[PDB]
Amino acid sequence: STGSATTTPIDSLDDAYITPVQIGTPAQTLNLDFDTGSSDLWVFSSETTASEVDGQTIYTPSKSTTAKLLSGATWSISYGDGSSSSGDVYTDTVSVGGLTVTGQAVESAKKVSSSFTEDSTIDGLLGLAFSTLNTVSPTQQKTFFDNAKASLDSPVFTADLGYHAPGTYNFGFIDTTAYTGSITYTAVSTKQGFWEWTSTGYAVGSGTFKSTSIDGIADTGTTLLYLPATVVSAYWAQVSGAKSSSSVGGYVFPCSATLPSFTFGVGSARIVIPGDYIDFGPISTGSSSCFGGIQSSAGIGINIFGDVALKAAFVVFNGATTPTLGFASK
């Protein structure tokens, strides 16, 4: 089997991407944030505290003839940005882009934090990291990819995120028309439950490539590119007027600037992030100070290749017995 679904930016900054997902019988279609940095499939639902729902589409399990309460199961998750959600669990039929999994754990939110409530465009998350991170208790549950893997033509999914434009998530096959050149594959550690790999270095604009190992995670659920303070300082030093602002919470730069590109290494290959991809616009409406898309990881504890980096590439998440990641230019 295979599946193929279009993923669409939620706003003009590409702050996140939503992909339609069919849940239950008859189908209830919710727009979920596919997140390779977490491992829970959770949804706004008929059980969510009413004051915490503000425009999202909800899953109503009582209207699904295939929904079954997973008795005793609860879940509770906290994300790197400080947001959180929790609830109980059903199993139901879930389809993405024509690919169907029966018996998928669908985590129904009873509570969500304010940032979820405030984002009317995201109806939940679909986690695509390793199932060892799933928060369901007392019986941990498998991700959608883990459940579908055996049925897929090839045990892979691919992320092809657009810059200010729609893109595609494919399951079970590699679309050779979707990228240029060849795919360079690189080793993955699953020891922290993430798609964790080691970049071989970086360049800033037309500058020379610096060979240096940068361990980090491929995370479609994080907007920006978070890298060590040395690397980020070297980038922003090439932008006149750029500075790190503690009051804003990161590097800002004059909105009048033209940003340099940023290159990251994948083995001997190179992925170029155009400068425009690093512009996240005014810090507040009407300001001439703009927020940078490359930020320091020093306060996180891990480097994060988020959407800013991933959308410059065609990315293969290879879930073979020894997982690997692949990157191609496009």
Give the domain ranges of the chain. 5-174, 175-330
246 is a catalytic site residue: no
Distances (CA, A) of 249 to 78, 205, 259, 296: 20, 24, 19, 10
Listing DSSP states for 173-197 in one string gives ---TTSSSS-PEEEE-B-TTSS-EE
Tell me which architecture the domain covering 175-330 has in CATH: Beta Barrel (2.40)
What letter does residue 208 receive in the DSSP assignment?
Answer: P
CB contact burial 50-84 (16+ within 10 A = b; e otherwise): eebbeebbbbebeebebbeebeebebebebeeebe
Same fold, 5-174 and 175-330: yes
Residues in a beta bridge with 126: 34, 41
Given the residues 38, 85, 108, 199, select the one marked as catalytic.
199
Which three-class secondary structure state does DSSP give residue 215? Answer: strand
Query: Contact 278/308 with Cβ under 8 angstroms?
Result: yes
199 is a catalytic site residue: yes
What letter does residue 59 receive in the DSSP assignment?
Answer: B
The type of residue at 88 is: D
Q: Tell me the structure's resolution in angstroms, rounded to a single decimal.
A: 1.4
Fold of the CATH domain 5-174: Cathepsin D, subunit A; domain 1 (2.40.70)
**Phi and psi (nearest 5°) for 150?**
-60, -30
Query: Contact 326/183 with Cβ under 8 angstroms?
Result: yes
**Phi and psi (nearest 5°) for 72?**
85, -10
The type of residue at 67 is: A
Query: Contact 330/260 with Cβ under 8 angstroms?
Result: no
The type of residue at 249 is: G
CA nearest neighbour of 195 among 272, 295, 271, 305: 305
